Each structure stands twice: as C-alpha cells, then as structure tokens.
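User: I'm putting together a teaching handout on how multi-component assemblies are represented. Below are the sequence lines for each component of a complex, exactly as they appear in our records. Could you produce the 3D structure of the whole assembly as structure tokens, so the students can see both representations side by side? Please keep the chain order the same as the input.
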Amino acid sequence: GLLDGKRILVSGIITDSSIAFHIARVAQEQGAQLVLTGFDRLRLIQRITDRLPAKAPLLELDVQNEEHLASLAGRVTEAIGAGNKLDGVVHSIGFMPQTGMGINPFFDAPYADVSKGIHISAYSYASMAKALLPIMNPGGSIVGMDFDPSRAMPAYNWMTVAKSALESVNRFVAREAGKYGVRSNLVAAGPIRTLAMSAIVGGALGEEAGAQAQLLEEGWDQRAPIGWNMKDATPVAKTVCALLSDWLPATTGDIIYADGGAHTQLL
Amino acid sequence: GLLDGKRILVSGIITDSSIAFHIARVAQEQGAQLVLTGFDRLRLIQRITDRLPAKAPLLELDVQNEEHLASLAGRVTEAIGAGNKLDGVVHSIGFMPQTGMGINPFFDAPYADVSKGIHISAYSYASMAKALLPIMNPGGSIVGMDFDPSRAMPAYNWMTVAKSALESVNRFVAREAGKYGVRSNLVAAGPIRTLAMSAIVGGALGEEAGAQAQLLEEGWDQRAPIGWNMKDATPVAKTVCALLSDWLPATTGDIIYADGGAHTQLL
Amino acid sequence: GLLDGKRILVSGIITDSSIAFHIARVAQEQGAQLVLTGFDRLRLIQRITDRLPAKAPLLELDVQNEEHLASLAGRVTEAIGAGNKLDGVVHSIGFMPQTGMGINPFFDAPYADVSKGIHISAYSYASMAKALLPIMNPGGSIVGMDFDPSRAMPAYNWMTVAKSALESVNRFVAREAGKYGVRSNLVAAGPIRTLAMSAIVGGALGEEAGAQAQLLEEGWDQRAPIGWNMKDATPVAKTVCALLSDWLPATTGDIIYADGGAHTQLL
Amino acid sequence: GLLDGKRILVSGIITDSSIAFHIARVAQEQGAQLVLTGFDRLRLIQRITDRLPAKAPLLELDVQNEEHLASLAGRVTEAIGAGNKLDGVVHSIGFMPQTGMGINPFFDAPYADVSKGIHISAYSYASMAKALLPIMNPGGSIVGMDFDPSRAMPAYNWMTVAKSALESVNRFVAREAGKYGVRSNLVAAGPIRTLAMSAIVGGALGEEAGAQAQLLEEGWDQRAPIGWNMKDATPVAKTVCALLSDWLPATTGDIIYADGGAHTQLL
Ligand SMILES: NC(=O)c1ccc[n+]([C@@H]2O[C@H](COP(=O)([O-])OP(=O)(O)OC[C@H]3O[C@@H](n4cnc5c(N)ncnc54)[C@H](O)[C@@H]3O)[C@@H](O)[C@H]2O)c1
Ligand SMILES: NC(=O)c1ccc[n+]([C@@H]2O[C@H](COP(=O)([O-])OP(=O)(O)OC[C@H]3O[C@@H](n4cnc5c(N)ncnc54)[C@H](O)[C@@H]3O)[C@@H](O)[C@H]2O)c1
Ligand SMILES: NC(=O)c1ccc[n+]([C@@H]2O[C@H](COP(=O)([O-])OP(=O)(O)OC[C@H]3O[C@@H](n4cnc5c(N)ncnc54)[C@H](O)[C@@H]3O)[C@@H](O)[C@H]2O)c1
Ligand SMILES: NC(=O)c1ccc[n+]([C@@H]2O[C@H](COP(=O)([O-])OP(=O)(O)OC[C@H]3O[C@@H](n4cnc5c(N)ncnc54)[C@H](O)[C@@H]3O)[C@@H](O)[C@H]2O)c1
Ligand SMILES: Cc1ccccc1Oc1ccc(Cn2cc(-c3ccccc3)nn2)cc1O
Ligand SMILES: Cc1ccccc1Oc1ccc(Cn2cc(-c3ccccc3)nn2)cc1O
Ligand SMILES: Cc1ccccc1Oc1ccc(Cn2cc(-c3ccccc3)nn2)cc1O
Ligand SMILES: Cc1ccccc1Oc1ccc(Cn2cc(-c3ccccc3)nn2)cc1O
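Assistant: Of course. Below is the structure of the complete assembly, with chains in the same order as your input.
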C-alpha cells in the first residue's frame, strides 16, 4: 500500500469517467484516507462517489465563490479530525465557455468568457493552495491537471491558453508551497474519455467533430511509443499517485507527462 | 532603407524611455510611414511623438475599450487614406495592478486584478489581431513584446503568468493571421529601465523587490555571452524591426530572443 | 515493497557515493533482486557492492568493448537463471577526458577525445538497449542518468554536449524499446558530490573552474523552491526507483527532473 | 543593399540546389564579398559557383582534415587581402552514413559510422569557429544549419542526434565568440529538397522514400500557419542573411525557426 496514512483532498469529480474518480480510486486502493470536493450538481456527485472503495467525505467547493474558499480549511479540518493535516491535494478542475472552443472562431470569444475559463482552469490552482497549504504537513504534495499547451492545436483554442497559464501559475505555487516543505506539480495526460471530453470539447466541435478521432488517434496513439488509450484513465491516475507518494521527492514546479511519450515524438 | 514603403501601426508609446518609442524611431529611420496609438494621457503622448524623426498620426486605443477596438478598424484607414493597408503591426502593451507585482504576495493578488492585467497584457494581442487583420497586406508581420516567462522568478509574479499566456495566444494568432498572409511573433527582450521597470527597481514596489531586481539586471549581463545593457533600447527596437521586414519570412507563431543570449546560458 | 519481485540490472557503481550505488541500495530496500556491472577497477568494485544491503552478482561491462556488449545478453540470463528476464535496466555511466572539461578551453578538445566521451556517455545508451531489450520483460523500465544540458555553462563543456546527445538518443530508444513493451527515460539530477564531480570542485581541474563550481552548487539551493543539498543522493536514487516501478506507466522517451525544482526557477 | 561591404565565408555548396548555394546568391544580391569553401569535388563546385551572380574565391575544406582547418585562417586572409577581416560565416555542413539513416535500424548503426556523422555535421561547427574567430571583426555573425531535433521522428535517426548536439555546441561557441563581439546562431529550417535529402535520407529510405517525401511536404504545409513549399529554398536563405546583418544584434547562442512556423503547431 503506497499512500498509507496520507490524507488527501481530491476535487473535480462529476462522473465515474471523470479523471479525479480514478485518481481517488487508485489512491484508496493504496491506503489513502480521502476528502473529496464537488461543484454545482452535489446530489449527483454524491451518488457517483459511493461507487469508490471507501466511504469518503464530500465537501462543496465552487472555486469562484470567495466564501467557499475561506471556509475550506475549516470544513476540511472538521472532516479528517482537527489535529490532523493534509498530505495531498489533487486539483482536477477545469472549465471554459463553449464560445472559445472548437469551430467557434478564436477571435470571436469575448474576454468575459475567456476570463471565466482562466479563473477556474488556472487561477483556481493558486487560490486553492492559499486555502490548503496552511493545513498541510511537510513532504506532502499538490498535483494539478494539465494538457500540453506548448504547441497550438485545432479546437483546444482558449483552453490551451488557460492551461498555458496553469503551468506558469504552478511554477509560482511551488515557491510558496516549498516554504511549507510541499511540492507542486502538474500531470500532462493524453486524451481520456470523460464528461468534459465529450460535452465541452465534444459539443463545441459541431459538424467538424468527426475530426476528434483523426486529430487525436493521429497525434497520440500513432506518436506514442507505448501506445495511448482514450478509454483507460488508470495510467494517469497511477501517475498522479506517484507525485502524491514520497517517490518523486525532488520534483516540484514540474510537469510530468502521462501521455504515452507522445510529446517526445513528432510522428 | 529597410522598412521602406511599409506602413506600420505601433502601440504602447508612453514616454521616450518606452520600448514602443524606440521601435517607432528605428522604424522611421528605415523608411517606415507610421501610425501610432496611445492610451490614457493622450496630450502628453502627443508631445513625445513629435520628437520622433517624422510626424506620424496618433489614435486613441484603450485596449480594454470595446468601442475603440471596433472603430479602430476604420480610424486607421481614414488615417493613411483608403485604398492603402498596413504591412505590419507592433503591440508593445502591458499592465498589472501593483498586487501581482513586487513585494506584494503571490496569493494575495485578487482575480479581479489578475484579470485586468491579463486582459491588457495577453488577450489584447488577439483583440488587435481581429481588429486589424482585415486592413493588413499580405507579407505583413505582427510583432508582440514578451519577457521570458518559461521559468518563475520573484516579484514579476502574475505578470509572468500573463506573459506565459501571451505566448500561447501568439501561436493562436499565428494560425488566423496565416489566412491573410501574415506572421505573428514575439520579441522576448531582456530588461530595459523604463516607466514600468525602474519604478520597482528603486524600492517603490519594496526594498526587497529592488533587491531581487539587481540580481536580475546584473546577473543577466553576466550570462549574456555578448553582454547586456539595461539602458540601450536600440537592439530590441532593431530586432523588432527585423520581423517587420521582408527578411524573416518563415517565422510565425514563434519567439525571437533579443536578450543578448542570456536565455541560452546558465552561468 | 516497491520493486518487490522485479529483477533490475544496475550499471555504473564505482564508490559508495556514486549515484549508481544509492539507486541500487534503495532498489534493494524495495525488494528488487539485482544484477550489477562494473568497469576498470573491478576488484575494488567487488569490495563496494558487498556493503549493499543484499548479495548481488557482478558482471564486467566495458561499454566501449564491442564484445562485452555481445555476451552481456547471455551472461545476465546465466546470472538470474534462463526462463527469467529483467524488469528494469539502469544506466548511470559517464565519462569525459579532462580536455573537454575544466580550465581546459572549449576549443582545445580534439575530436578524438570528444568522441570518446560521447561513445561512453551517450551512444552507450542505445548500446545497452540493443544488448538487453531481448532479455527484458514487458512493463519493464529503462532509466539513465542525465544532467540538464538545455542551457550551456562554464567548465562542463563537452559533457554538456554529450548529454544533449544522450537526451536525443533517449527519445529514439523509446521508440525501439516500445516494441518490447518497455519505457525508456532519464532522471535529470541536480549536482551530487560523487567523486567524479567533487574532483573539479576543489581545484583539481583548475581554481577558476572550481570557482565557477560552487557558484552553481549554491546557486542551486537558492533557486530550488524546496532547496537542494548536494551531499544527499537519496532523493534522486528514489526518483530512479519511481520509473523502474509500475507507477509511471505512461511516460517514455521523457526526462524527469529530480533537481529540487531548480530548472523551473530563474532566481 | 543589406550586407553592403561585408565579407562572408560560405561553406558547403555542392549543387545549385544546395542550401548554401541560395544563401550565397541572396547574400550577393545584398552586396556581399564572398569566400566559399567546398569539399572533395572542388572542380565541379567551381562549375556551379560561376552560376552565382558574382565571382568569388573558393577554398578547399575537409572539416575532418586536421591540416585544412589548421591552414584555413591563412588561405582566407590571403584571399580577401590582409588587414581585412570576416563579418560572416555560414556553416552549411552535414553528413551521416546511410547506416544510421532511414529504415536502416537504429541500434544497428555502428558507433564507427555514428561518430563520423557527428564530427562532420556537429563538432565541425566548433572547429570552424576556432579556425575563423581570430580573423573576425566585432559585430560579425556565425550561422549554422539545424533541423529541429527536440522531438524524435522516423528516418532522421542518428542525424537527429547530431543536430541535437550541433545546438549544444552552438551554445558554447556563442560564449567563446562572445570574447570577440561575435554572434553564433543556428537556423532551424523546414525541409528543403536538396542533394543530401535525396541521396542520404531518401537513399537510406529504400523504395518508400519519395513516398514519405511527398507526404512530408503535405503534412508540413499543413502544420505551417503560413504554408510551406519544399521546392523553394529562398525563405531560409533570406532568414540566414537576417542573422548575418546588423539587424538581430542581440541574438546569440540562439536558434531562429525558418520552418513556416510548423514547430509551434501540433496540427
Ligand atoms: N480527459 C482529458 O482528455 C484531459 C487530459 C489532460 C488534462 N485534463 C484536465 O484535467 C482535469 C480533468 O477533467 P475531466 O477530463 O475529468 O472532465 P470532468 O468535467 O469529468 O472533470 C472536471 C471537473 O471540473 C469541475 N468544475 C467545473 N467548474 C468548476 C468550478 N467553477 N469550481 C470547481 N470545480 C469546477 C467539475 O465539477 C468537474 O468534475 C481538468 O482540469 C482538465 O482540463 C483533461
Ligand atoms: N521594459 C522592459 O524591460 C521590457 C522587456 C521585455 C518585454 N517588455 C514588454 O514590452 C511591452 C511594453 O514595455 P514598456 O517598457 O514599454 O512599458 P511602458 O510602461 O514604458 O509602456 C507600455 C504601454 O502599456 C500601455 N497600456 C497599459 N494599459 C493599456 C490599455 N488598457 N490599453 C492600451 N494600452 C495600455 C501604456 O499606455 C503604455 O504606453 C509589454 O508587453 C511588456 O511586458 C518590457
Ligand atoms: N555526479 C553528479 O552530480 C551527477 C548529476 C546528474 C547526472 N550524473 C550522471 O550520472 C552518471 C554517473 O555519475 P556518478 O555521480 O555516479 O559519478 P561516477 O564516476 O562514480 O559514475 C560514473 C561511471 O563511469 C563508469 N564508466 C566509465 N567508462 C565506462 C565504460 N566504458 N563502460 C562502463 N562504465 C564506464 C565508471 O565505472 C563509473 O561507475 C553519468 O551518466 C553522469 O553524467 C551525475
Ligand atoms: N535539406 C534540408 O531541407 C535541410 C533542413 C534543415 C537543415 N539542413 C542542413 O543544412 C546543411 C546542408 O544541407 P543541404 O540541404 O544543403 O544538402 P547539400 O548536400 O546540397 O549541402 C551539404 C554540404 O555538406 C558538405 N559536406 C559533407 N561532408 C563534409 C565534410 N566532411 N567537410 C566539409 N563539407 C562537407 C557537402 O559536400 C555539401 O556541400 C546541413 O547542416 C543540413 O543538416 C538541411
Ligand atoms: C475540464 C475541461 C474544461 C474545458 C476544456 C476541456 C476540459 O477537459 C479536457 C478534455 C479533453 C482534453 C484533451 N482533448 C481535447 C480534445 C481535442 C479535440 C480536438 C482537437 C484536439 C484535442 N481531445 N482530447 C483536455 C481537457 O482539458
Ligand atoms: C508594461 C508593464 C506593466 C506591468 C508590468 C510590467 C510591464 O512591462 C514590463 C517591464 C519590464 C519587463 C522586464 N523586467 C522584469 C524585471 C524584473 C522585475 C521584478 C523582479 C525581477 C525582474 N525587470 N524588467 C517586463 C515587462 O513586461
Ligand atoms: C560521469 C562523469 C564523467 C565525466 C564528467 C562528469 C561525469 O558525471 C557528472 C558529474 C557531475 C555532474 C553535475 N555537476 C556538474 C558540475 C559543474 C561543474 C562546473 C560548472 C558547472 C557544473 N558540478 N556537478 C554531472 C555529471 O554528468
Ligand atoms: C546534410 C545532411 C546529411 C545527412 C542527413 C541529413 C542532412 O541534411 C538534411 C537533409 C534533409 C533534411 C530535411 N528532411 C528530413 C526528412 C525526413 C524524412 C522522413 C522522416 C523524417 C524526416 N526529409 N527531409 C534535413 C537535413 O538536415
């Protein structure tokens, strides 16, 4: 059991296909005690989480609500029992208005919208560290989720630009985080079939949405030396737990690529 | 002459210390017929432009102003005579509330503020692109000003994150600018003491900021294999003018490091 | 146990301060049955390995010897018993003649000598993948030691170049090793005083070179957001064990930074 | 004219479709006094060099020839008149045995051949810099030819490794030419149909060469935001002149991308 002891916060669950779900599962399979946080559809996230191995707490956290952020360390400490601190925080959060995604012209998305995506997808990583680092033991990890925005691509539009700032924010978080002996990292996963995969990126594609298999399976399974599997999230979960473990103890402000090696290949 | 005949629009002039002032001057010397935009202190900017070698038109461009961007389309054409287009555009524009800068803590920066910075620092590259690309001739360049943000650093804080996104946006303009025959690039300059810079370097933004800003400005020259001068703005103006020219016709979505080679060395 | 049941070959031990030795000890601690290789002073190496927490077989491997490579495939299976195969291979091997290193100019190293360093430090990575992939299991892992050569530096000179090579070779091996079910990566470690290093650090390879040394070695702890101490190889000896394990299953051709996060920071 | 009165040494011409040939032509149009260096078939190079828009001195230079480099500064001074110096060096030199190219398996290229490949196409950039830096005026430029080696790719095999070091070397020539006030940069060009393309890459690629070649132009013009045409060598010739002129006066140890901007895009 790799994450034994280790109390870990885990945000961004919505379905049993949602990335955070498998991070949560694999964590529990390795002896982690969890605290999970939801957003908007709580009765529904609630139903989902019972499928996880252990009975685990569920806090509400709209990452745009300044009140939810203040009362966060509060609500958490009362869930793992005061005295005990957090060893891990997982940030699997993202949103971006459909107006700056897929076939909708890049120039046409308004800043009002792109701000919302950037607030949730990237800034919220720093605002969560503010909230949680206090209630964290030294040697514990923060892990956030990233998709390689280092090159531009069709569809991913303004979410590329957001994830691009996520990366930057993550290198500045690892400094504040290090003051407490805590690491801050992102995992750059390949594509995984989840809700956002199909609803956000999927719907904003419209007619040229048959692209999603050409582009993708082209840029990933074809490129990856060990193959990629859009239907298999356990790889990226296994990788997220490695950063939560003590086994990458000198890695911080970094990005790990769980993408089948596809960013290191051109063809 | 170099930019002979070409019609370049240049934004971001505020003083004669400003990067935009030099890009403008060096341009004019090479035969560029200009158009300028300023922001806020228009009468004060009017004074400074008359110091440039030749007289050039001046337009008001609040980059946050929805009206301005829209009419900007026309106001320019009315300024160079309809039946004439721009063969280049320079975006030397930037901002961040003294809270995502300096001694001011990284976490303390409110998103309300971090956004106002990003709106002006990064997004407005796409703003101007959509605004102006219709009145742009094939063969033209768009050149934005950038500061190497791939690594974190003290004080610069949320401006790094904004510059980090501005780079990602640059690659998504490159794609749309490509329709019209235009290249999109950033010149990553090293530091020049200006209105914005020298403010935080004297302790106005804290004594511990001006401290960390020495180590930067000094250690930069050390690394630069051909040296670095905070006071000479001419080489970056010269480099920006090279992209405006006919001489880099295979560069787009890309970044040119005009930093005296500093980013390539470790010590 | 982490490598519980895995049978890993570890090259490159020469003292009890070699990055190798620690990788091997930590690997043994986690339940990994081992096989080792040594070079040159084989008699003294014998002494060293015995101080390991477990008995391990020792093979001779002059990575330049085109014969040693040829038999190596077989000599190993002989050492773990036919019908058994390796679940991991480690490559902590490197060498550069004191002419492309130190007070010695960059220009003065002859190609004869530069090549020797490149044969042992870079090419010899594919050398061993060739020799060993046949006898490797699926799920297996290849890991070799890297030192961040993306930016140039004083003194390291040609070993810098040979790492830039080694980095590229790693991405190719990944393609070939992917055929057998095997990931191939590099742990990019910070500086460790491991004899090899600590030689130049005291004035052996010049006093001005040893000067430029501690400016790096200390410039590191300052940059590293969680700090970095050069006398402790246990953080990196673990990050190697992370890749050998089954917890990094989506990563190949990649480079992991166990450097205390100093490659992410500028200051 | 752009390079008026400047004296420039261009190596590695061998056809009228060689890249160094177009670099020569375009420089002369800008008004440069050239000095060329060929290799082996010096008499045939001579027939080709009269095709140039001017007459210019042609020397013999086997970069693998200890005598040639040794005499090199000599027979150059002699051919531009003494008291005069160089302002420009173009390094357009490359080679790798067919054994480490195309479909010829990667592990099977012997280090014997992989070494010759490096030395010539990589090391030689440093050994020429030594040869000429003495005889260069401050303000000059050394320029190399590079293919983007950051990600791996089919066929380009061990030549990816050479170019992968040709960069690491170029960052060390940068700081030794720093001493003399001279810049050292590489131009990463896109694919351009030349002799080497057809003989070494399309030669060691079997019957399926030319098929991958037609499919590369397509899948590059695609990725390029401003398109790309393999038959036109002009744009990369124009980019290398931009690096010789005064106009990128603060760019050294760096790489300029002349690929139509394809590396910044993923699809
Ligand atoms: N599956 C992919 O292809 C993929 C690959 C790499 C990285 N990512 C990133 O990793 C994460 C995983 O996303 P996913 O694939 O699981 O889709 P998902 O929608 O199932 O998970 C994303 C989560 O965002 C949460 N969320 C949305 N708005 C919020 C707000 N205002 N405040 C707090 N939470 C909010 C949702 O409740 C949801 O559970 C995201 O950050 C995403 O951008 C996804
Ligand atoms: N000073 C340096 O050392 C340096 C180095 C590298 C990159 N840069 C970048 O170059 C650009 C400008 O640098 P600078 O030294 O000239 O700063 P500056 O303060 O001297 O002038 C920059 C411009 O910001 C403009 N601006 C602010 N808000 C605006 C808005 N809402 N709408 C339109 N314009 C607005 C101002 O009007 C001003 O003219 C920026 O993008 C900056 O990040 C500066
Ligand atoms: N010392 C550090 O701080 C440091 C940091 C990052 C990466 N590295 C890398 O890690 C590896 C080893 O570093 P180290 O700290 O263990 O120093 P070390 O000298 O103790 O280990 C280097 C190895 O070179 C081996 N060697 C030389 N020629 C050989 C050949 N022909 N065949 C087989 N082995 C040969 C030696 O036997 C020795 O074990 C290298 O690849 C090196 O560049 C070292
Ligand atoms: N062909 C492309 O599209 C392309 C793209 C990016 C970079 N490049 C680079 O540009 C340069 C030239 O390639 P090219 O397209 O002009 O092919 P080319 O063969 O027409 O020119 C290459 C030159 O290398 C010379 N050469 C080979 N061995 C030599 C040696 N031992 N000493 C001195 N000269 C030697 C050749 O004789 C020839 O003149 C190389 O560095 C190459 O890798 C080419
Ligand atoms: C949570 C969230 C909010 C907002 C946006 C996305 C999102 O979640 C993600 C969903 C999928 C991916 C990866 N991805 C994209 C597409 C694709 C389609 C077309 C072109 C190229 C990529 N396919 N696989 C990354 C994500 O971050
Ligand atoms: C217009 C504008 C508004 C708001 C902020 C910046 C800005 O413009 C810039 C001005 C100078 C630079 C370069 N730079 C960095 C530093 C430094 C500072 C603090 C700490 C360590 C380094 N000094 N000089 C970059 C800019 O983007
Ligand atoms: C195995 C081997 C053979 C030959 C040479 C090196 C070598 O191995 C390494 C030893 C130490 C390092 C890390 N490192 C570099 C320096 C340093 C010195 C001068 C300037 C700036 C850095 N100090 N610590 C990396 C290595 O690859
Ligand atoms: C001078 C020299 C000696 C030896 C080898 C190359 C060389 O020079 C070059 C020749 C052509 C290119 C461009 N390129 C690559 C390939 C390709 C085909 C298939 C897959 C992936 C790449 N096709 N076109 C680049 C070069 O640097």
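A couple of points students might notice: Residues B 12-15, 18-20, 39-40, 61-64, 92-95, 120, 145-147, 189, 191-192, 194-197 surround nicotinamide-adenine-dinucleotide (ligand 2) (CB under 6 Å). The radius of gyration of chain B is 18 Å.
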